[PDB]
Design a protein around this ligand. Sequence first.
Ligand code: CA
Length: 147
Amino acid sequence: VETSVYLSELEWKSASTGYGEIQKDASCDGNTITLKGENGEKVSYDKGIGTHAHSEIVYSLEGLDYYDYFETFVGVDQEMAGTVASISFEVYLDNEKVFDSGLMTGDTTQKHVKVPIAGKNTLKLVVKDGGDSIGSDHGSFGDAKLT
Ligand SMILES: [Ca+2]
């Protein structure tokens, strides 16, 4: 088995997005995924999932009970720096929310997610539209993986 498994290596049970394709290892516009770093500069990610509010992406963890955590960084993909981008990220394990970023705009520093998955069957990623419109709502999951 792999020591970690990127979500981009897995097939989802279902996936919706507000634009285009859910992109494997790229932003929803097909660029290298970038998030806002603590120093104000971009942080680039080789692996991850790029999507667009409103998005719900559901993965089965059947045959993946090997792993302790789901880990990822989340934020507005910095291809939309300077825009009206406004989103939130939620992560569910089975039927409960385990992570909620609250509102993130283009300048909001990326957030790290590390949630335990032991004993759970289903991982669901949600990108919501910040309560305005989906305009510029490009949300990326940097380094998203089971580990
Ligand atoms: Ca929005």
